[PDB]
Amino acid sequence: PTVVVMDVSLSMTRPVSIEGSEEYQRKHLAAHGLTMLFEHMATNYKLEFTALVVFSSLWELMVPFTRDYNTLQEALSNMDDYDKTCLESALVGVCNIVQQEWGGAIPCQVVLVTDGCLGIGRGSLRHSLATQNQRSESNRFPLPFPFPSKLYIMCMANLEELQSTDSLECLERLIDLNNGEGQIFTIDGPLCLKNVQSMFGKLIDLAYTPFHAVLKCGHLTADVQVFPRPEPFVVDEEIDPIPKVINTDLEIVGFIDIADISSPPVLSRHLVLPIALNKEGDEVGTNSANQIAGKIPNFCVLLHGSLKVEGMVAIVQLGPEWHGMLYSQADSKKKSNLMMSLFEPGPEPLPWLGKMAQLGPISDAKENPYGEDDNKSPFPLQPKNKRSYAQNVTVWIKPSGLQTDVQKILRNARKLPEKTQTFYKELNRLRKAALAFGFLDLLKGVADMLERECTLLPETAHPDAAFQLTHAAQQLKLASTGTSEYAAYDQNITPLHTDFSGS
Amino acid sequence: PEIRVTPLGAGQDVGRSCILVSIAGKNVMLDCGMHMGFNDDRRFPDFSYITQNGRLTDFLDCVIISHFHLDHCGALPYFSEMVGYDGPIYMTHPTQAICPILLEDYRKIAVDKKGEANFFTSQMIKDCMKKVVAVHLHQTVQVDDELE
Amino acid sequence: VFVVDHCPYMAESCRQHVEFDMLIIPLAPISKSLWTCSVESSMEYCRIMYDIFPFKKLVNFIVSDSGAHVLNSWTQEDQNLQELMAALAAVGPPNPRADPECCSILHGLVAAVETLCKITEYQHEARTLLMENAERVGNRGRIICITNAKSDSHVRMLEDCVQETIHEHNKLAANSDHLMQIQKCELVLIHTYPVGEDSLVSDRSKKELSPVLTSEVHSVRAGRHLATKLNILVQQHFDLASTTITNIPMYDVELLHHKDAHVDFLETITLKWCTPRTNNIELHYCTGAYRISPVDVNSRPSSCLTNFLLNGRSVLLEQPSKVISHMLSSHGGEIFLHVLSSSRSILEDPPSISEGCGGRVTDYRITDFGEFMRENRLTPFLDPRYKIDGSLEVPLERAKDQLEKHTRYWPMIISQTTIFNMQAVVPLASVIVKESLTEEDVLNCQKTIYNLVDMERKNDPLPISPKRDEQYRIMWNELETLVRAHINNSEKHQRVLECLMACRSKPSLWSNRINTANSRKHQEFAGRLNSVNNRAELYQHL
Ligand SMILES: [Zn+2]
């Protein structure tokens, strides 16, 4: 699991810096950290397994895992020492071990008292955390560990004091260059007593915070209320520069279905607590204590009842005549992903919700919105194109990579109009992708199979899909002029047809 | 930087003692007496001078009572409960002990020997006593951050 | 801005084949034009910008040919690649043969650099409503490419000829359709090309197409510095971050995680592997996520891995706060990855009911409840018709009112019911809601309103499926409930009195400090404001 990156240098047992790191020795800093972070440690870091074991060269997982919740300060308080001193395996080796045996996503609290001292001359090893610019010879190596990790700041030497020998840059450019996570936590100058807990104090009040937000559709009469607040979440920046507010234009619209929903990108934990209340909107009473009050019916979200048979999802009204696509897990009642979300705004319409800003046909339409094999229909609304796993995938980073991506996208995208289950699902995903991307493999294997299937299959469709091939050769032959009047392109192929009389 | 004093009662008379002092933005009432002899509408001080049809607690931060005489504390229950002053009222311990019985006697007089259409009652007298803060001799209390 | 034609005068080969990963008909040639080769690398170029915003618009390209136009689409429906591809390939579809057409630059050299930010009539919005912008434009583009041909000046001949032809007809200098008349500009470009072969190509060679544009080049190896160093600074400084995960569990696959998790936290890469299951509790709601924009956008685990992932759920195999190792998902427009919990969120052993309603929801049979398809038909549309007519109104305020009157609250569950719980509940919205309404349903509902109060202990013919013996007050409660029939929003089911007679019941140091003191003061007395000569009349009403 996650391992705290402790320095394996002999100086780690003794104080830090050339003459003084900050305030008293390491014991005082450890005691201050234990006293200030005890409330946070007992409530937020109860499941973080860290062991204060000895190491010769780098942090390694040898001792059995233990539930250390208030022994973090003990790691730097009267810790054991070993007869080894490896300066090159203190940060680089520990970071590599964390990246490999613990991954870039694991709860790790790298908080300890370490010297972090460079050489007494031209021996500064700044490649441990600043491999991006300094020591470019190792730029192609695993360094500088570009992955999420705990902040390690070494504010031992003062920038003003170390500037006499022109060595201030080496000592100061350590914390700030460590992946640049959010902001540079580096203090240059004199040290005070309160600076010991300054590093640990960055998350004193950053565990939980109250909020006010309610998820509902239109007005309703059994709307769910959410008393506890969730973690911060925002999809865009302009719409959420400050805390969220409620407008006076609530509306409910859109179909809810899981047949053609799939896993969409969700970044909002707008959970609805399951409880039933009157029009006033009180709490109504909201080891598990929910069972006692859960005997009465509850609303929660619209997908609570359908989360088992079909695995439906909960939709949040993003606005009038403008909505989005949500998603939910196949789980029935364990989690169910009971939290709505809306795709982040952008110059293109929705990340996966398609064009939800245009209202057209409602019930009467040429194509049935119900669908047969999760084809393109407005029930539920979704993007016109499919996912990159199926077709319409534009990934060209290398010629071989582009060819492989084209082949994968155009593997089953070449389907003739013989089966109604996928007549309007990927009809235009074969020729356009093969021609625009210039994929020889698709034009050789997929295109020939598609042409053979189309020839074998019936071609008694409407004249737009059948009679258009008679004059196509004439149009191609008579394209020598190349003028703008010889080519027409205003809209692509659409499923709807005109209602003109045949004369 | 001015001390503005407006005695709206007992200015050039004896009775209905009620003096307003604005010293540093702290508006204090120095007494809340009542007049004797007047039949109606002049027994109590004119509290329309302090922006009537509003909350008196915002304007006044402290009300002080010198002693338990009716010309120094008689209008206290009417003032407080009726006009809606929920702020502190300062008065010594014997003043706190002996004030409500004088008010009760005058209330008995008003309900029996005269009319009582526009007078207060015993329950409303007891309601006023809740806001009272007893102050001992030479006890420099801190009613506000800077006012003592 | 401008791209040269597909003249076959200069050609080169890089031995580019199809990289097979697993281990009779004719084969089409892999011949491609220099402009096509340069454009083909633009997909990797957009990967760097995708980190800033993955759901934003993409970038197209236009060249000088027979179809010399800067036609592009910016509409919401046209934002996808299905519609914009036909306008960027207007110069000719992919057909391997000798094409004599489009070789001459005299086909047209006006409205040339208008294919990166110009708007079209496909949308009804304005420029400001879309994205606007000034000099610094997010939709703006430049010319940067690393291809192989005979020389860099071979493609410059067509551009020079086009520029000369444009200059030869400069009479209509003050006339344009919608865009500005571009005169000159300077273009900064970078160097990047796919790996696979040694550096047997130009290292510091720059191509110029017009006197206005004159780029400069330098020796910088791609991949080692272009992707490993530039992307790191381009991601962290663009309100995003990148993580390291295993590519093939046991081409690099890169996950996405925000820096908020790192802030709140305090030689083969090893990661766990698991397969999805139909019945498994391992997926939760992602409170935060990041957009994955890896250079290897066409790696092996991109299509086959996602084939068995249509359920939408993820599977995590925790050792013995669970942390995920890798995730794969295709959202159609961008690839996104989600990280595990980092803040004080109850993810392990959450408030799951795990009993009662939620799984057995079948009270609303689909046999005759499908009449709601008309009253609540407001859904998004992707392709409109030429014109529409019928019983409808503008979609600004009528749609919300119609939905509110039709589907504001349509809950149906058998967990608990005491208002419509009657044996004659057939008159509910499943069949009552119809365009041609009849008074028979209203009369039946009114009769059932009294019937429910009359009888509530017996079971209906349909399968139904504070001490004890409290059912005595149930009849009184039902009678009280029936009294409120003409309440809430039930106008059709309202009943005043029908059969209540039979068995139903009835109811300057001294300046600054003085200013500071006077600034923090309190409201004035009304009488003092209204006073005259520092005196005011008391008891004015008398
Ligand atoms: Zn007196």
Residue numbers in the entry:
A (entry chain n): 2 to 287, 297 to 513
B (entry chain k): 2 to 149
C (entry chain m): 11 to 33, 41 to 267, 279 to 294, 312 to 365, 370 to 514, 523 to 564, 655 to 689
Paper excerpt:
The Integrator complex can terminate RNA polymerase II (Pol II) in the promoter-proximal region of genes. Here we present three cryo-EM structures of the complete Integrator: one bound to the PEC in the pre-termination state; one bound to Pol II in the post-termination state; and one of the complete, free complex in an inactive state.
We determined a cryo-EM structure of the complex at a resolution of 3.1 Å. The higher resolution enabled us to improve the previous model of the free Integrator–PP2A complex and to include the tail module and the N-terminal region of INTS1 (residues 143–1318). The Integrator subunits INTS3 and INTS12 and the SOSS factors were not present in this structure, although mass spectrometry confirmed their presence in the cryo-EM sample. Superposition on our pre-termination structure shows that the location of the INTS1 N-terminal region is incompatible with Pol II binding. The INTS1 N-terminal region in the free Integrator–PP2A structure also occludes the binding of INTS3, which instead binds to the open Integrator conformation in the post-termination structure. The INTS6 acidic residues D629 and E630 within a conserved DEAD motif of the INTS6 inhibitory loop mimic phosphoserine and phosphothreonine residues and bind to the PP2A-C active site to block substrate binding.
